[PDB]
C-alpha cells in the first residue's frame, strides 16, 4: 500500500494502489504517492 | 554534441515535409520536439519498426552517450534563464491495462527521466479529457483542447503527443510606439496590411546564395542573455518563392550562422505574429521511411508490450508561437531592413545549435 521505490514501474494491476503518473485521474494513488514520486 | 545536431537535422527534415504539404499557409513547428519524442519511441520498438526510425533519425538512442546528451539538452531548456518562455511536453500514451514487458519502465525512466503514460482509451471521453488536461497543465495552460471529440476511439491503443509553446523575451525589445500597420506582400501577388514592429539596433545581417544562385538574407534577433536567437530568413528578390529557401535550409547551415565581425546599426521592421499549428505527423514520418509504426499488424512495439498487438493510432505535434515587442505583459537614417514578404524564422538554442522552432510566415 506504499509507493516507496515504485514510482518508476508504471501501472500494476496486482497492487492495491497505484504509483503511475496518471493515477490521480483514476483516483487510485497510494496516499504517499506525492511524497515518494 | 553530435546528437544535438543529428536530432536537429532529423527535425528539420520533418519540417520540410510539413512545409511541402502546407500550401500558402503559415506553419510553426518544432524540430527539437519531434526528434525528442521519436528518440523515446525508439525504446518501445523492435524489428523493422525500430530500424526505420533509427535509419531516418541517424542514430540509436541506446548507443553510448546518446541518451545522456538528450537529457542534458532537456535539463538545460528548463534552466532558470527560461522565464516561462518555452513550455514543452512530450508524452507517449498506451492502453492502461495492457501488460508491459518486464523492466521496460525503469529502463525508459533511466534514459529519459519520465515514463510512458497509461490511460484507459476504452473510456473514450475520459481518456480524451485526461490527455488534454495533461497537455494543458504541462504547457502552462497554453495548449488546451489538443484532441477534439472523435479524435480517438475505443480501439485506440497508442498515441504520441508533443506540445510546445514559445514566447521569447528580446535582449532589446521593440518600442511599442514604433508599431503600426504596414503593407505586407503575399506570395500570390496580393497585398495586406499588418502591424509591424520597428527598432534601430546593431543586428547580424548576412547575405548568402542558394545552389541555384538566389540571394537570401539572414537576420539574427537575440533573446535575453543570448541563450536563444530568432533568425529571420528570406530571399532578397520578391519574385523568389519561400520554398527555394526552405528546401536547402538544413541543421548544418543554421548551426553555422554566426556573428558579424563588426555589427552595424540598422532600422529593422518586422511583422508581429501569433501562430498556432497542429501537425499530424503520420504523412511526414512515412515520407521519411517510418511506415511500419502506423500499420496495425506490421508495427513492432514488442519492447513496450509483447502481450498484444500495438501500433501508433495518432502522432501529433501542436505548437504555439508568439512574436511581439517584448514577450512580456509590459508596455515599453541608417540602412533599413524591411520584412514585408513571406519569411522563415528559426529559434536556435545558441550553446548547442539546437533548432527548437522553425516556421514559415506566409501571412502575419
Coordinates of N, CA and C in Angstrom, one line a residue, chain B residues 93-321:
Chain B
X93 N 1.3 7.8 -24.8 CA 0.1 7.2 -24.1 C -0.1 5.9 -24.6
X94 N -0.2 4.9 -23.7 CA -0.5 3.5 -24.1 C -1.8 3.0 -23.3
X95 N -2.5 2.1 -23.9 CA -3.6 1.5 -23.2 C -3.2 1.0 -21.8
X96 N -3.9 1.6 -20.8 CA -3.6 1.4 -19.4 C -3.4 0.0 -18.8
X97 N -4.3 -0.9 -19.3 CA -4.3 -2.2 -18.7 C -3.6 -3.2 -19.6
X98 N -2.9 -2.7 -20.6 CA -2.0 -3.6 -21.5 C -0.8 -4.0 -20.7
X99 N -0.6 -5.3 -20.6 CA 0.6 -5.8 -19.9 C 1.9 -5.4 -20.6
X100 N 2.8 -4.7 -19.9 CA 4.1 -4.3 -20.5 C 5.2 -5.2 -20.1
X101 N 6.2 -5.2 -21.0 CA 7.4 -6.0 -20.8 C 8.1 -5.7 -19.5
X102 N 8.5 -6.8 -18.8 CA 9.2 -6.7 -17.5 C 10.4 -5.7 -17.7
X103 N 10.5 -4.7 -16.8 CA 11.6 -3.8 -16.7 C 11.7 -2.7 -17.8
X104 N 10.6 -2.6 -18.6 CA 10.6 -1.6 -19.6 C 10.6 -0.2 -19.0
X105 N 9.7 0.0 -18.1 CA 9.6 1.4 -17.5 C 10.8 1.9 -16.7
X106 N 11.4 1.2 -15.8 CA 12.6 1.6 -15.2 C 13.7 1.9 -16.2
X107 N 13.8 1.1 -17.2 CA 14.8 1.3 -18.3 C 14.4 2.6 -19.1
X108 N 13.2 2.8 -19.4 CA 12.7 4.1 -20.0 C 13.0 5.2 -19.1
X109 N 12.7 5.1 -17.8 CA 13.0 6.1 -16.8 C 14.5 6.4 -16.7
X110 N 15.3 5.4 -16.7 CA 16.8 5.6 -16.6 C 17.2 6.5 -17.8
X111 N 16.8 6.2 -19.0 CA 17.2 7.0 -20.2 C 16.6 8.4 -20.3
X112 N 15.3 8.6 -20.0 CA 14.6 9.8 -20.2 C 14.1 10.6 -19.0
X113 N 14.1 9.9 -17.8 CA 13.6 10.6 -16.6 C 12.1 11.0 -16.7
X114 N 11.3 10.1 -17.4 CA 9.9 10.2 -17.4 C 9.4 8.8 -17.7
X115 N 8.1 8.6 -17.8 CA 7.6 7.3 -18.1 C 6.6 7.4 -19.3
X116 N 6.2 6.2 -19.8 CA 5.1 6.1 -20.8 C 3.8 6.1 -20.0
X117 N 3.0 7.1 -20.3 CA 1.7 7.2 -19.6 C 0.7 6.2 -20.0
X118 N -0.2 5.8 -19.1 CA -1.0 4.6 -19.2 C -2.5 5.1 -18.9
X119 N -3.3 5.2 -20.0 CA -4.6 5.8 -20.0 C -5.6 4.8 -20.6
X120 N -6.8 4.8 -20.0 CA -7.7 3.8 -20.5 C -8.6 4.4 -21.6
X121 N -8.1 4.1 -22.9 CA -8.8 4.5 -24.1 C -10.2 4.0 -24.3
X122 N -10.5 2.9 -23.7 CA -11.9 2.3 -23.8 C -13.0 3.2 -23.2
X123 N -12.7 3.9 -22.2 CA -13.5 5.1 -21.7 C -13.1 6.3 -22.5
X124 N -13.7 6.4 -23.7 CA -13.3 7.4 -24.7 C -13.2 8.9 -24.3
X125 N -14.4 9.4 -23.9 CA -14.4 10.8 -23.4 C -13.5 11.1 -22.3
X126 N -13.4 10.2 -21.3 CA -12.5 10.4 -20.2 C -11.0 10.4 -20.6
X127 N -10.6 9.4 -21.4 CA -9.2 9.4 -21.9 C -8.8 10.7 -22.6
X128 N -9.8 11.2 -23.4 CA -9.5 12.5 -24.1 C -9.5 13.7 -23.2
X129 N -10.3 13.7 -22.1 CA -10.2 14.7 -21.1 C -8.8 14.6 -20.4
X130 N -8.3 13.3 -20.1 CA -7.1 13.1 -19.4 C -5.9 13.6 -20.3
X131 N -5.9 13.2 -21.5 CA -4.8 13.6 -22.4 C -4.7 15.1 -22.6
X132 N -5.9 15.7 -22.8 CA -6.0 17.2 -23.0 C -5.5 17.9 -21.7
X133 N -6.0 17.5 -20.6 CA -5.6 18.1 -19.3 C -4.2 18.0 -19.0
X134 N -3.6 16.8 -19.3 CA -2.2 16.6 -19.2 C -1.4 17.6 -20.0
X135 N -1.8 17.8 -21.2 CA -1.1 18.7 -22.2 C -1.2 20.1 -21.7
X136 N -2.4 20.5 -21.3 CA -2.7 21.9 -20.8 C -1.8 22.2 -19.6
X137 N -1.8 21.4 -18.6 CA -1.1 21.7 -17.3 C 0.5 21.6 -17.5
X138 N 0.9 21.0 -18.6 CA 2.3 20.8 -18.8 C 2.9 21.8 -19.9
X139 N 2.0 22.6 -20.4 CA 2.4 23.7 -21.2 C 1.9 25.1 -20.6
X140 N 1.8 25.1 -19.3 CA 1.4 26.3 -18.5 C 0.1 26.9 -19.1
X141 N -0.8 26.0 -19.4 CA -2.2 26.4 -19.9 C -2.3 26.9 -21.3
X142 N -1.2 26.8 -22.0 CA -1.1 27.3 -23.4 C -1.7 26.4 -24.5
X143 N -1.5 25.1 -24.4 CA -2.0 24.2 -25.4 C -3.2 23.5 -24.7
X144 N -4.4 24.0 -24.9 CA -5.6 23.3 -24.5 C -6.4 22.7 -25.6
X145 N -7.3 21.8 -25.3 CA -8.1 21.1 -26.3 C -7.3 20.5 -27.4
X146 N -6.2 19.8 -27.2 CA -5.5 19.2 -28.2 C -6.3 18.3 -29.1
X147 N -7.1 17.4 -28.4 CA -8.0 16.5 -29.0 C -9.4 16.9 -29.0
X148 N -10.1 17.1 -30.1 CA -11.5 17.3 -30.2 C -12.3 16.0 -30.1
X149 N -13.6 16.1 -30.0 CA -14.4 14.9 -30.0 C -14.2 14.0 -31.2
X150 N -14.1 12.7 -31.0 CA -13.8 11.8 -32.1 C -12.4 11.7 -32.5
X151 N -11.5 12.5 -31.9 CA -10.0 12.3 -32.2 C -9.4 11.0 -32.0
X152 N -9.9 10.3 -31.0 CA -9.5 8.9 -30.6 C -10.8 8.1 -30.4
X153 N -10.7 6.8 -30.5 CA -11.8 6.0 -30.2 C -11.5 4.8 -29.3
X154 N -12.5 3.9 -29.2 CA -12.4 2.7 -28.3 C -11.2 1.8 -28.6
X155 N -10.8 1.8 -29.9 CA -9.8 0.9 -30.4 C -8.4 1.5 -30.4
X156 N -8.3 2.8 -30.0 CA -7.1 3.5 -29.9 C -6.3 2.9 -28.8
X157 N -5.0 2.5 -29.0 CA -4.2 1.9 -28.0 C -2.9 2.6 -27.7
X158 N -2.4 3.4 -28.7 CA -1.1 4.1 -28.6 C -1.1 5.4 -29.4
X159 N -0.7 6.5 -28.7 CA -0.8 7.9 -29.1 C 0.4 8.6 -28.7
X160 N 1.0 9.4 -29.6 CA 2.2 10.2 -29.3 C 1.8 11.7 -29.4
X161 N 2.2 12.4 -28.4 CA 1.9 13.8 -28.4 C 3.1 14.6 -28.1
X162 N 3.3 15.8 -28.8 CA 4.3 16.7 -28.5 C 3.7 18.1 -28.6
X163 N 3.7 18.8 -27.5 CA 3.1 20.1 -27.5 C 4.1 21.2 -26.9
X164 N 4.2 22.3 -27.6 CA 5.2 23.3 -27.2 C 4.5 24.7 -27.3
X165 N 5.0 25.6 -26.4 CA 4.6 27.0 -26.5 C 5.9 27.8 -26.4
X166 N 6.0 28.9 -27.2 CA 7.1 29.8 -27.2 C 6.7 31.2 -27.3
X167 N 7.2 32.0 -26.4 CA 7.2 33.5 -26.4 C 8.4 34.0 -25.8
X168 N 9.4 34.4 -26.6 CA 10.7 34.8 -26.1 C 10.7 36.3 -25.7
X169 N 11.6 36.6 -24.7 CA 11.8 38.0 -24.3 C 13.1 38.5 -24.9
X170 N 13.0 39.5 -25.8 CA 14.1 40.0 -26.6 C 15.2 40.6 -25.7
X171 N 16.4 40.5 -26.2 CA 17.5 41.2 -25.5 C 17.3 42.7 -25.5
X172 N 16.9 43.2 -26.7 CA 16.4 44.6 -26.9 C 15.0 44.5 -27.4
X173 N 14.0 44.8 -26.6 CA 12.6 44.9 -27.1 C 12.4 46.0 -28.1
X174 N 11.3 45.8 -28.9 CA 10.8 46.8 -29.8 C 10.0 47.8 -29.1
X175 N 10.2 49.1 -29.2 CA 9.4 50.1 -28.6 C 8.0 50.0 -29.2
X176 N 7.0 50.0 -28.3 CA 5.6 49.9 -28.6 C 5.1 51.0 -29.6
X177 N 5.6 52.2 -29.4 CA 5.2 53.4 -30.1 C 5.6 53.3 -31.6
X178 N 6.6 52.5 -31.9 CA 7.1 52.3 -33.2 C 6.3 51.3 -34.0
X179 N 5.3 50.7 -33.4 CA 4.5 49.7 -34.0 C 3.3 50.3 -34.7
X180 N 3.1 50.0 -36.0 CA 1.9 50.5 -36.7 C 1.7 49.6 -37.9
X181 N 0.6 49.8 -38.6 CA 0.2 48.9 -39.7 C 1.0 49.2 -41.0
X182 N 1.5 48.2 -41.6 CA 2.2 48.3 -42.9 C 1.8 47.3 -43.9
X183 N 2.1 47.6 -45.2 CA 1.8 46.7 -46.3 C 2.7 45.5 -46.2
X184 N 2.1 44.3 -46.4 CA 2.8 43.0 -46.5 C 2.4 42.3 -47.8
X185 N 3.4 41.9 -48.6 CA 3.2 41.4 -49.9 C 3.1 39.9 -49.9
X186 N 1.9 39.3 -50.2 CA 1.8 37.9 -50.1 C 2.3 37.2 -51.4
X187 N 2.6 35.9 -51.3 CA 3.3 35.2 -52.4 C 2.4 35.1 -53.6
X188 N 1.0 35.1 -53.4 CA 0.1 35.1 -54.5 C 0.0 36.5 -55.2
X189 N 0.8 37.5 -54.9 CA 0.8 38.7 -55.6 C -0.2 39.7 -55.0
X190 N -0.9 39.3 -54.0 CA -1.8 40.3 -53.3 C -1.1 40.9 -52.0
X191 N -1.7 42.0 -51.6 CA -1.1 42.9 -50.5 C -2.1 43.1 -49.4
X192 N -1.6 42.9 -48.2 CA -2.4 43.1 -47.0 C -1.7 44.0 -46.0
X193 N -2.5 44.6 -45.1 CA -2.0 45.5 -44.1 C -1.8 44.7 -42.7
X194 N -0.7 44.9 -42.1 CA -0.4 44.1 -40.8 C 0.4 45.0 -39.9
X195 N 0.2 44.8 -38.6 CA 1.0 45.5 -37.6 C 2.5 45.0 -37.7
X196 N 3.4 46.0 -37.8 CA 4.8 45.6 -37.8 C 5.6 46.4 -36.8
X197 N 6.5 45.8 -36.1 CA 7.3 46.4 -35.1 C 8.5 47.0 -35.8
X198 N 9.2 47.9 -35.1 CA 10.4 48.5 -35.7 C 11.4 48.9 -34.6
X199 N 12.6 48.6 -34.8 CA 13.7 49.1 -34.0 C 15.0 49.3 -34.7
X200 N 15.8 50.3 -34.2 CA 17.1 50.6 -34.7 C 18.1 49.9 -33.7
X201 N 19.0 49.1 -34.2 CA 19.8 48.2 -33.4 C 21.0 47.7 -34.2
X202 N 22.0 47.1 -33.6 CA 23.1 46.5 -34.4 C 22.9 45.0 -34.4
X203 N 22.2 44.5 -35.5 CA 21.9 43.1 -35.7 C 22.9 42.5 -36.7
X204 N 23.2 41.2 -36.5 CA 23.8 40.4 -37.5 C 22.9 40.3 -38.7
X205 N 23.4 40.7 -39.9 CA 22.7 40.6 -41.2 C 23.5 40.2 -42.3
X206 N 23.4 38.9 -42.7 CA 24.3 38.2 -43.6 C 23.6 37.8 -44.9
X207 N 24.3 38.0 -46.0 CA 23.8 37.6 -47.3 C 24.4 36.2 -47.7
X208 N 23.6 35.3 -48.2 CA 24.1 34.0 -48.8 C 23.5 33.8 -50.1
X209 N 24.0 32.7 -50.8 CA 23.3 32.2 -52.0 C 22.8 30.8 -51.9
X210 N 21.7 30.5 -52.6 CA 21.3 29.1 -52.8 C 22.1 28.5 -53.9
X211 N 22.1 27.1 -54.1 CA 22.8 26.5 -55.2 C 22.4 27.0 -56.6
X212 N 21.1 27.3 -56.8 CA 20.6 27.9 -58.0 C 21.0 29.4 -58.1
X213 N 21.8 29.9 -57.1 CA 22.3 31.3 -57.2 C 21.3 32.4 -56.8
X214 N 20.3 32.0 -56.0 CA 19.4 33.1 -55.5 C 20.0 33.6 -54.2
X215 N 19.9 35.0 -54.1 CA 20.4 35.6 -52.9 C 19.3 35.5 -51.7
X216 N 19.8 35.2 -50.5 CA 18.9 35.3 -49.4 C 19.6 36.0 -48.2
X217 N 18.8 36.6 -47.3 CA 19.3 37.3 -46.2 C 18.9 36.7 -44.8
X218 N 19.9 36.6 -43.9 CA 19.6 36.1 -42.6 C 19.9 37.2 -41.5
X219 N 18.8 37.5 -40.8 CA 18.8 38.5 -39.7 C 18.7 37.7 -38.4
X220 N 19.6 38.0 -37.5 CA 19.6 37.4 -36.2 C 19.0 38.4 -35.1
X221 N 18.1 37.9 -34.3 CA 17.5 38.7 -33.3 C 17.6 37.9 -32.0
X222 N 18.6 38.3 -31.1 CA 18.9 37.6 -29.9 C 17.8 37.9 -28.8
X223 N 17.4 36.8 -28.1 CA 16.6 36.9 -26.9 C 17.5 37.2 -25.7
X224 N 16.9 37.5 -24.5 CA 17.7 37.9 -23.3 C 18.8 37.0 -22.9
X225 N 20.0 37.6 -22.7 CA 21.1 36.8 -22.2 C 21.8 36.0 -23.3
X226 N 21.4 36.1 -24.5 CA 21.9 35.4 -25.7 C 21.8 33.9 -25.7
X227 N 20.9 33.3 -24.9 CA 20.7 31.9 -24.8 C 20.0 31.4 -26.1
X228 N 19.0 32.1 -26.5 CA 18.2 31.8 -27.7 C 18.4 33.0 -28.7
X229 N 18.2 32.6 -30.0 CA 18.1 33.6 -31.0 C 17.0 33.3 -32.0
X230 N 16.3 34.3 -32.4 CA 15.4 34.1 -33.6 C 16.2 34.5 -34.9
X231 N 16.2 33.7 -35.9 CA 16.7 34.1 -37.2 C 15.6 34.3 -38.1
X232 N 15.7 35.4 -38.9 CA 14.7 35.6 -39.9 C 15.4 35.5 -41.3
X233 N 14.8 34.7 -42.2 CA 15.4 34.3 -43.4 C 14.4 34.6 -44.6
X234 N 14.9 35.2 -45.6 CA 14.1 35.5 -46.8 C 14.9 35.7 -48.1
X235 N 14.4 35.3 -49.2 CA 15.1 35.7 -50.5 C 15.1 37.2 -50.6
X236 N 16.1 37.8 -51.2 CA 16.2 39.2 -51.4 C 15.2 39.7 -52.4
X237 N 15.0 39.0 -53.5 CA 14.1 39.3 -54.5 C 12.7 38.9 -54.2
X238 N 11.7 39.8 -54.4 CA 10.3 39.4 -54.1 C 9.7 38.3 -55.0
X239 N 10.2 38.2 -56.2 CA 9.7 37.1 -57.1 C 10.1 35.7 -56.7
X240 N 11.1 35.6 -55.8 CA 11.6 34.3 -55.4 C 10.7 33.7 -54.3
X241 N 10.1 32.5 -54.5 CA 9.3 31.8 -53.6 C 10.0 31.3 -52.4
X242 N 9.3 31.3 -51.2 CA 10.0 30.9 -49.9 C 10.5 29.5 -50.0
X243 N 9.9 28.7 -50.8 CA 10.3 27.3 -50.9 C 11.7 27.1 -51.4
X244 N 12.2 28.0 -52.3 CA 13.5 27.9 -52.8 C 14.6 28.0 -51.7
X245 N 14.1 28.4 -50.5 CA 14.9 28.6 -49.3 C 14.7 27.5 -48.3
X246 N 13.4 27.1 -48.1 CA 13.1 26.0 -47.2 C 13.8 24.7 -47.5
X247 N 13.8 24.4 -48.8 CA 14.3 23.1 -49.2 C 15.8 22.8 -49.0
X248 N 16.5 23.9 -48.6 CA 18.0 23.9 -48.5 C 18.5 24.3 -47.1
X249 N 17.6 24.9 -46.3 CA 17.9 25.4 -45.0 C 18.0 24.4 -43.9
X250 N 19.1 23.6 -44.0 CA 19.4 22.5 -43.1 C 19.9 22.9 -41.7
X251 N 20.0 21.9 -40.8 CA 20.5 22.0 -39.5 C 22.0 22.4 -39.5
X252 N 22.7 21.9 -40.5 CA 24.1 22.2 -40.7 C 24.3 23.7 -40.9
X253 N 23.6 24.3 -41.9 CA 23.6 25.7 -42.2 C 23.3 26.6 -41.0
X254 N 22.2 26.2 -40.3 CA 21.7 27.1 -39.2 C 22.7 27.2 -38.1
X255 N 23.2 26.0 -37.6 CA 24.1 25.9 -36.5 C 25.4 26.6 -36.9
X256 N 25.6 27.0 -38.1 CA 26.8 27.7 -38.6 C 26.6 29.2 -38.8
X257 N 25.4 29.7 -38.6 CA 25.1 31.1 -38.6 C 25.7 31.8 -37.4
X258 N 26.5 32.8 -37.6 CA 27.4 33.3 -36.6 C 27.4 34.9 -36.6
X259 N 28.1 35.5 -35.6 CA 28.2 36.9 -35.6 C 28.9 37.6 -36.7
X260 N 28.5 38.9 -36.9 CA 29.2 39.8 -37.8 C 30.5 40.2 -37.2
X261 N 31.6 40.2 -37.9 CA 32.9 40.7 -37.5 C 32.7 42.1 -36.8
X262 N 32.0 43.0 -37.5 CA 31.6 44.2 -36.9 C 30.1 44.4 -37.2
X263 N 29.3 44.3 -36.1 CA 27.8 44.5 -36.2 C 27.5 46.0 -36.6
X264 N 26.5 46.2 -37.4 CA 26.2 47.6 -37.8 C 24.8 48.0 -37.5
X265 N 24.6 49.3 -37.2 CA 23.2 49.8 -36.9 C 22.4 49.7 -38.1
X266 N 21.1 49.3 -37.9 CA 20.1 49.2 -39.0 C 18.7 49.4 -38.4
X267 N 17.8 50.0 -39.1 CA 16.4 50.0 -38.7 C 15.8 48.8 -39.2
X268 N 15.3 47.9 -38.3 CA 14.6 46.7 -38.6 C 13.1 46.9 -38.4
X269 N 12.4 46.5 -39.4 CA 10.9 46.5 -39.5 C 10.5 45.0 -39.7
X270 N 9.7 44.5 -38.7 CA 9.3 43.1 -38.6 C 7.9 43.0 -38.2
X271 N 7.1 42.2 -39.0 CA 5.7 41.9 -38.5 C 5.6 41.2 -37.2
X272 N 4.7 41.6 -36.4 CA 4.2 40.8 -35.2 C 3.5 39.6 -35.8
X273 N 3.6 38.5 -35.1 CA 2.8 37.3 -35.4 C 2.5 36.4 -34.2
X274 N 1.3 35.8 -34.2 CA 0.9 34.7 -33.3 C 0.4 33.6 -34.1
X275 N 1.1 32.5 -34.1 CA 0.8 31.3 -34.9 C 0.5 30.1 -34.0
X276 N -0.4 29.3 -34.5 CA -0.8 28.0 -33.9 C -0.9 27.0 -35.0
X277 N -0.1 25.9 -34.9 CA -0.2 24.9 -35.9 C -0.3 23.5 -35.2
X278 N -1.3 22.8 -35.6 CA -1.4 21.3 -35.3 C -0.9 20.5 -36.5
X279 N 0.1 19.7 -36.3 CA 0.6 18.8 -37.3 C 0.3 17.4 -37.0
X280 N -0.3 16.7 -37.9 CA -0.5 15.3 -37.9 C 0.9 14.7 -38.4
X281 N 1.7 14.1 -37.6 CA 3.0 13.6 -38.0 C 3.0 12.4 -39.0
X282 N 1.9 11.7 -39.2 CA 1.9 10.5 -39.9 C 2.5 10.6 -41.3
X283 N 2.0 11.4 -42.2 CA 2.5 11.5 -43.5 C 3.9 12.0 -43.6
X284 N 4.3 13.1 -42.9 CA 5.7 13.4 -42.8 C 6.6 12.3 -42.4
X285 N 6.3 11.5 -41.3 CA 7.1 10.4 -40.9 C 7.2 9.2 -41.9
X286 N 6.1 8.9 -42.5 CA 6.1 7.9 -43.6 C 6.9 8.3 -44.8
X287 N 6.8 9.6 -45.2 CA 7.7 10.1 -46.3 C 9.2 10.0 -46.0
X288 N 9.5 10.0 -44.7 CA 10.9 9.8 -44.3 C 11.3 8.3 -44.0
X289 N 10.4 7.4 -44.4 CA 10.6 6.0 -44.2 C 10.0 5.3 -43.0
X290 N 9.3 6.0 -42.2 CA 8.7 5.4 -41.0 C 7.3 5.0 -41.1
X291 N 7.0 3.9 -41.9 CA 5.7 3.5 -42.3 C 5.2 2.4 -41.4
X292 N 6.0 1.4 -41.0 CA 5.6 0.3 -40.1 C 4.9 0.7 -38.8
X293 N 5.4 1.8 -38.1 CA 4.9 2.2 -36.8 C 3.4 2.5 -36.8
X294 N 2.8 2.9 -38.0 CA 1.4 3.2 -38.2 C 0.6 2.0 -38.6
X295 N 1.2 0.9 -39.0 CA 0.4 -0.2 -39.6 C 0.0 -1.3 -38.6
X296 N -1.3 -1.4 -38.4 CA -1.9 -2.3 -37.4 C -1.2 -3.6 -37.1
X297 N -0.9 -4.4 -38.1 CA -0.3 -5.7 -37.8 C 1.3 -5.7 -38.0
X298 N 1.8 -4.9 -38.9 CA 3.2 -4.8 -39.2 C 4.0 -4.1 -38.1
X299 N 3.4 -3.1 -37.4 CA 4.1 -2.4 -36.3 C 4.6 -3.3 -35.3
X300 N 5.8 -3.1 -34.9 CA 6.5 -3.9 -33.9 C 6.9 -3.0 -32.7
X301 N 6.1 -3.1 -31.7 CA 6.3 -2.4 -30.4 C 6.5 -3.5 -29.3
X302 N 7.2 -4.6 -29.7 CA 7.4 -5.6 -28.7 C 8.4 -5.3 -27.6
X303 N 9.1 -4.2 -27.6 CA 9.9 -3.8 -26.5 C 9.1 -3.1 -25.4
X304 N 7.9 -2.6 -25.8 CA 7.0 -2.0 -24.9 C 6.0 -3.1 -24.3
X305 N 5.4 -3.8 -25.2 CA 4.5 -4.9 -24.9 C 4.6 -6.1 -25.8
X306 N 4.9 -7.3 -25.3 CA 4.9 -8.5 -26.2 C 3.6 -9.3 -25.9
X307 N 2.6 -8.7 -25.3 CA 1.3 -9.4 -24.9 C 0.3 -9.3 -26.0
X308 N 0.0 -8.1 -26.5 CA -1.0 -7.8 -27.5 C -0.3 -6.9 -28.6
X309 N -0.9 -7.0 -29.8 CA -0.5 -6.1 -31.0 C -0.7 -4.6 -30.7
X310 N 0.3 -3.8 -31.1 CA 0.3 -2.4 -30.9 C 0.8 -1.7 -32.2
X311 N 0.2 -0.5 -32.4 CA 0.6 0.4 -33.5 C 0.2 1.8 -33.1
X312 N 0.8 2.8 -33.7 CA 0.5 4.2 -33.4 C -0.8 4.6 -34.1
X313 N -1.8 4.9 -33.3 CA -3.1 5.4 -33.8 C -3.0 6.8 -34.2
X314 N -2.1 7.6 -33.5 CA -2.1 9.0 -33.7 C -0.7 9.5 -33.2
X315 N -0.1 10.4 -34.0 CA 1.1 11.1 -33.7 C 1.0 12.6 -34.0
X316 N 1.0 13.4 -33.0 CA 0.6 14.8 -33.1 C 1.7 15.7 -32.5
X317 N 1.9 16.8 -33.2 CA 2.6 17.9 -32.6 C 1.7 19.2 -32.7
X318 N 1.7 19.9 -31.6 CA 1.0 21.2 -31.7 C 1.8 22.3 -31.1
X319 N 2.0 23.3 -31.9 CA 3.0 24.4 -31.5 C 2.2 25.7 -31.5
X320 N 2.5 26.5 -30.5 CA 2.0 27.9 -30.5 C 3.2 28.8 -30.3
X321 N 3.4 29.8 -31.1 CA 4.4 30.8 -31.0 C 3.9 32.2 -31.0

